[PDB]
């Protein structure tokens, strides 16, 4: 033929069949032992998610949400993702004492449901009403963005203490139980309005620590609705929403490390 005879062509096939078969069987074996060394409830390493990311619902083309108020299908793209998220926070999804629980309607302290063990059933998560998100189809004019803190197993988000000076200096400082979120731009051509649990501009600490998908399915993380009823129009406004805390940090590279990058433009 090309290389060899039929007899040789066969033998080279019988070899590579057994050979690659063995190699596949060995590869799988090493994957088995790897998995055997891992927990079902907690990942081996967590230093790469460490400082929590802050992500929002409006799917930004490039950290930007520009549209026209005087146009219907101009914002119907951002309403798709906005709906996708809030559709999960339905009351019909949170039914019965299992696996949900009614928690303080005001920001409270942490809740420990034991260890990362299966020695108990599904760890009961705090309910969250999308109805706590006042004012927010969504904002056809002047968007109503929804913030979110990335989930990390066993992470206890710790707010800053009012020992020294603060950006939003001491205003509504629920020091003990709220992780604040203050959006900014100089360039003050807007109108910041925050909505959340208990009416505070933060995340209620009663939703922590997260026990993971395996030990807490259907779990709901707290949301923080933000509305920009800015009196300006037809210009790119670089708005940055920042979260503050002891366990919260940022990076010049990762522009989502505990903060937002939104470029709103109501070009109408």
């Amino acid at each position: 033929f090309l290389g060899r005879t039929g007899s040789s062509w066969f033998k080279i096939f019988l070899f590579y069949l057994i050979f690659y078969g063995c190699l596949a069987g060995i590869f799988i074996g090493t994957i088995q032992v790897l998995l055997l060394t891992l927990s079902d409830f907690e990942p081996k390493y967590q230093d790469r998610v460490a400082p929590p990311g802050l992500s929002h619902a409006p799917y930004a083309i490039k950290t930007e949400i520009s549209f026209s108020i005087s146009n219907p299908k101009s914002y119907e793209s951002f309403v798709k993702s906005m709906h996708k998220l809030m559709d999960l926070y339905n009351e019909s999804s949170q039914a019965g004492n299992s696996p949900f629980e009614d928690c303080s309607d005001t920001p409270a302290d942490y809740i420990k449901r034991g260890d990362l063990d299966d020695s108990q059933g599904q760890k009961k998560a705090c309910r969250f009403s999308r109805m706590w998100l006042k004012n927010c189809g969504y904002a056809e004019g002047k968007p109503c963005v929804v913030a979110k803190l990335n989930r990390i197993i066993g992470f206890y988000p710790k707010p800053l203490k009012n020992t020294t000076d603060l950006p939003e200096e001491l205003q509504a400082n629920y020091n003990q139980y709220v992780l604040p979120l203050r959006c900014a731009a100089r360039e003050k051509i807007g109108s910041i309005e925050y909505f959340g649990l208990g009416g505070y501009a933060g995340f209620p600490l009663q939703y922590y620590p997260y026990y993971g998908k395996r030990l807490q399915k259907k779990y709901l993380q707290p949301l923080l609705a933000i509305q920009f009823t800015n009196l300006t129009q037809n210009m790119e406004l670089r708005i940055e929403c920042k979260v503050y805390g002891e366990n919260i940090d940022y990076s010049e590279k990762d522009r989502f490390r505990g903060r937002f990058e939104v470029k709103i433009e109501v070009k109408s």
């Binding site: 060995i26 967590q46 790469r48 990335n150 998908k213 490390r257």
Partner: protein, 992 residues
């Protein structure tokens, strides 16, 4: 074009002096007119040689920039700029990826260009050396007056004059001469002075006395002649053009390189476009379809391989430089290993090029002297009183002297003023009797008759050094038979005795044997003149026989020859044991050529020519079956009337071939004949008459000390110490480097698979990219470099000089067996070890292997800063990318770790590491430096930006260890099978 120049020349030495003048419109006495000479100048053109048109270095450099790998790397470099252009227009990408990768790849092509350019070097100044043989000026007779003119202004027809010490300015017809002798070594390779006279003495113009040639010099006397040829039209000017004009051609090693380039280029374009369409079918945007292709290019092309080859060659050439063997062309480092036939000059190559005493006949006994340079033999006789009598004649009846200031150099190597035979005798006595000058001071010469054409003897009368005598001793030497007709007694073991027919017959026997050995034989005799008949003041007349020259006492015979170099016989046998055929090709006479052939082992004992059979059986040569003769001796005059097909039959039908009295073109023809049969041929030589053959040879080797400038220009290799044993070393080195290149190539190729497979699974699996493009270049250009080179220092696995020369048609540098092992077996194991570490990194950070399938879409999505892992955690864009790049880093390090084992297994093709050992210090160096480089690239701060290399956790380093070990075991088991059964299965499938 040069087929005309490969033919024997035609001449006009047969014409009379007068007749020759009519042909050139010339005067025998007055010479040409100033006007007629200038007319002929413009007519024929200058008496000069024009160098052939060369290829500029520009075109030579750029021709390498387009050879398979460079072509693919160019397509990659441009395709980078393509994707970059498409980006800069569509979505403003502030990145530098495609732009920089395009710059990097273009640089890789340029630098790789320098390496191949360095390897494909051609240092040739043939025509320049020939031009150096034309004198600046010549002496001509014009308008009846002699004047010096620019030799280029010399034309056919003018009257030229030459004298001892000057170069022949052009081909001349001798019309007048006085004691003129010439050095025709340019045409023959033999430096013994040849007389020139107006008389025609041979039909063959290269042998007649009435022609003098350009490229030769007058050694003594004076001559006048008419110019018959000028410039390019001279006999050796044509040889110049032939030699300078000959197409170089591709070396065996070069052909091998191009061959695997085709193979690897083939699989590259195959998988390249095979997966380019496979991606579009899967619905991949052309934006991405090209990005994958660039990666495929980089994965398939072994970027550092061609440069490795060059370095391995260079390092092998450095070792040979250290044995006095200079390599002018890097590729010639290997040709000697692939050589199946050596065509060797005799004089100054196989031989020392110096008349040396070989045997002596005295006391009715043949004695042998030591002919070797360094005198590696033993003594023959010292005791016999006869010896001292013969020794005295050899010293006394001798007019040769050592040049001043030689006392530093060895006797046999020092320059001597005199003819070759007298120098030989001088050096013979000086060696075994001490200072000859002393013997010539103790015995003052009073009268002598120098060797005469008519007398055929030379005699001398000396004052006997003996005090009790202080009388007159007569000594003489000459033609053995002439000396015999002048002897009455023979000095036997001390005492004289009558010359009976018995001893006279033993003389003839001794004389015939020595002459049969191709040796020049001389007779020696002396006579103690009677005291009473010769007073202390008796005057001797040299002009008229004033003393007896008959009834003298015969002392002995001495024989001499230009002997082989000490190492030559043994080197010839070694070449022949390695299955190399050795042919002699010489301008010298057949009797001498044949005798040295037997001396060095070109013709082995018992082997006969058709002429030998005929003489032994006493039958006509036509009655001899030529197939009964394995040896042959072909004279150039017969070679001339043979067609190439008939020359091919001679080459095919004889194992032991001697081509004697060959012209320079004839040497070229014999070389071409050998090549025509498909053989790789080496030429060894030292003369300008070797230049065409040396050029045409696959490899020409010139002698460094004895070699002429031309020969060393025509060669690929120079033996700087004239050590013929270096050929044996050269062939051995050549074979070793050929095997080691295979090892180094397999090693380099093996790591291509773990660079290809990640890109494929990236498409078919939709997982995050396991390894990057930049990461690949860190391997092929970084870590693999020193290890790959180090394989050039591997010792032989067996006695390589015991095997036959490779068949260049069947035995390739890269074959299917190499690809099967490198691509199908070892590289495949390396790929898995890479993937394993990849799955380990991701799974330990929260992305278990199961959830990875079909995630790249969301993984690469720059706007999704919340991808969910297996544990329910959310990752930003840059966070998961850090893990991904950490995966690139550990995959990279996995390659290094699996290349550890590969380096050790590529060490040997057959033998076990437990047999060959670990005595390669460069290889071990490679292991340490490779690992140092990898660690540095991972842990050095800032490398995460320039190369996207991230720090690895200690446990990460050990992921591929079990795969590295399986490689070592697998290959060790496999080679154990090879050795345990030379049959073929494992052998014919995987044995590189």
């Amino acid at each position: 074009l040069d087929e005309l120049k490969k033919e024997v020349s035609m001449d006009d030495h047969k014409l009379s002096l007068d007749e020759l003048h009519n042909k050139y419109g010339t005067d025998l006495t007055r010479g040409l007119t100033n006007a007629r000479a200038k007319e002929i100048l413009a007519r024929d053109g200058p008496n000069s040689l024009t160098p052939p048109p060369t290829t500029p270095e520009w075109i030579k450099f750029c021709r390498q920039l387009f050879g398979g790998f460079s072509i693919l790397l160019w397509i990659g470099a441009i395709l980078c700029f393509l994707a970059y252009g498409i980006q800069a227009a569509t979505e403003d990408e502030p990145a530098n990826d495609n732009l920089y990768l395009g710059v990097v790849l273009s640089t890789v092509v340029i630098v790789t260009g320098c390496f191949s350019y360095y390897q494909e070097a051609k240092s040739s100044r043939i025509m320049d050396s020939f031009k150096n043989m034309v004198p600046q000026q010549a002496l001509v007779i014009r308008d009846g007056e002699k004047s010096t003119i620019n030799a280029e202004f010399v034309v056919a027809g003018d009257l030229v004059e030459v004298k001892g010490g000057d170069r022949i300015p052009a081909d001349l017809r001798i019309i007048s001469a006085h004691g003129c002798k010439v050095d025709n070594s340019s045409l023959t390779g033999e430096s013994e002075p040849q007389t020139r006279s107006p008389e025609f003495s041979s039909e063959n113009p290269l042998e007649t006395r009435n022609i003098a040639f350009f490229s030769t010099n007058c050694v003594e006397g004076t001559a006048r002649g008419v110019v018959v040829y000028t410039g390019d039209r001279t006999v050796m000017g044509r040889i110049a053009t032939l030699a300078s004009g000959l197409e170089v051609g591709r070396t065996p090693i070069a052909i091998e390189i191009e061959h695997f380039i085709h193979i690897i280029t083939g699989v590259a374009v195959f998988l390249g476009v095979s997966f380019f369409i496979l991606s579009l079918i899967l619905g991949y945007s052309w934006l991405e379809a090209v990005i994958f292709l660039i990666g495929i290019i980089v994965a398939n092309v072994p970027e550092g391989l061609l440069a490795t080859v060059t370095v391995c060659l260079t390092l092998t050439a450095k070792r040979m430089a250290r044995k006095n063997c200079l390599v002018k062309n890097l590729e010639a480092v290997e040709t000697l290993g692939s050589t199946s036939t050596i065509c060797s000059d005799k004089t100054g190559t196989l031989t020392q090029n110096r008349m040396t005493v070989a045997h002596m006949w005295f006391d009715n006994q043949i004695h042998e002297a030591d002919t070797t340079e360094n005198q590696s033999g033993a003594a023959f006789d010292k005791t016999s009183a006869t010896w001292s009598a013969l020794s005295r004649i050899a010293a006394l009846c001798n007019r040769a002297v050592f040049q001043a200031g030689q006392d530093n150099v060895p006797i046999l190597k020092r320059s001597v003023a005199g003819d070759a035979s007298e120098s030989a005798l001088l050096k013979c006595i000086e060696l075994c009797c001490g200072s000859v000058q002393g013997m010539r001071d103790r015995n003052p010469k009073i009268v002598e008759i120098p060797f005469n054409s008519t007398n055929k003897y030379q005699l001398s009368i000396h004052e006997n050094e003996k005090s009790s005598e202080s009388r007159y001793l007569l000594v003489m030497k000459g033609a053995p038979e002439r000396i015999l007709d002048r002897c009455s007694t023979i000095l036997l073991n001390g005492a004289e005795e009558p010359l009976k027919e018995d001893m006279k017959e033993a003389f003839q026997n001794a004389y015939l044997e020595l002459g049969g050995l191709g040796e020049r034989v001389l007779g020696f005799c002396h006579f103690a003149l009677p005291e009473d008949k010769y007073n202390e003041g008796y005057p001797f007349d040299a002009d008229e026989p004033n003393f007896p020259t008959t009834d003298l006492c015969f002392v002995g015979l001495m024989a001499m020859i230009d002997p082989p170099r000490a190492a030559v016989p043994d080197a010839v046998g070694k070449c022949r044991s390695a299955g190399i055929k050795v042919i002699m090709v010489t301008g010298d006479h057949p009797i001498t050529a044949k005798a040295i052939a037997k001396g060095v082992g070109i013709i082995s004992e018992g082997n006969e020519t058709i002429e030998d059979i005929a003489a032994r059986l006493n039958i006509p040569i036509g009655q001899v079956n030529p197939r009964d003769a394995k040896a042959c001796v072909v004279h150039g005059s017969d070679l001339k009337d043979l067609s190439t097909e008939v020359l091919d039959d001679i080459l095919h039908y004889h194992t032991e071939i001697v081509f004697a009295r060959t012209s320079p073109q004839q040497k070229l023809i014999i070389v071409e004949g050998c090549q025509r049969q498909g053989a790789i041929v080496a030429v060894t030589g030292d003369g300008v008459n070797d230049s065409p053959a040396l050029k045409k040879a696959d490899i020409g080797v010139a002698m460094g000390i004895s070699g002429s400038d031309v020969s060393k220009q025509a060669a690929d290799m120079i033996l700087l110490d004239d050590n013929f044993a270096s050929i044996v070393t050269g062939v051995e080195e050549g074979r070793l480097i050929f095997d080691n290149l295979k090892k180094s190539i397999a090693y380099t190729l093996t790591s291509n698979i773990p660079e290809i497979t990640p890109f494929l699974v990236f498409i078919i699996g939709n997982v995050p990219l396991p390894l990057g493009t930049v990461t690949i270049l860190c391997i092929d250009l970084g870590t693999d470099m020193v290890p790959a080179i180090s394989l050039a220092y591997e010792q032989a696995e067996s006695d390589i000089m015991k095997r036959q020369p490779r068949n260049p048609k069947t035995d390739k540098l890269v074959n299917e067996r190499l690809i099967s092992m490198a691509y199908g077996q070892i590289g495949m194991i390396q790929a898995l070890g890479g993937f394993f570490s990849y799955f380990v990194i991701l799974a330990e950070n929260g992305f278990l292997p199961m959830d990875l399938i079909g995630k790249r879409v969301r993984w690469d999505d720059r706007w999704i800063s919340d991808v969910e892992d297996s544990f329910g955690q959310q990752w930003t864009y840059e966070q998961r990318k850090i893990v991904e790049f950490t995966c690139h880093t550990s995959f990279f390090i996995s390659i290094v770790v699996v290349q550890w084992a590969d380096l050790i297994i590529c060490k040997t093709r057959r033998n076990s590491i437990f047999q060959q050992g670990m005595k390669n210090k460069i290889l071990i160096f490679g292991l340490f430096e490779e690992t140092a480089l990898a660690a540095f690239l991972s842990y050095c701060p800032g490398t995460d930006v320039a190369l996207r290399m991230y720090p690895l956790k200690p446990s990460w380093w050990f992921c591929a260890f079990p795969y590295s070990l399986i490689i070592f075991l697998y290959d060790e088991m496999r080679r154990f099978i090879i050795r345990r059964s030379p049959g073929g299965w494992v052998e014919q499938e995987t044995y590189y």
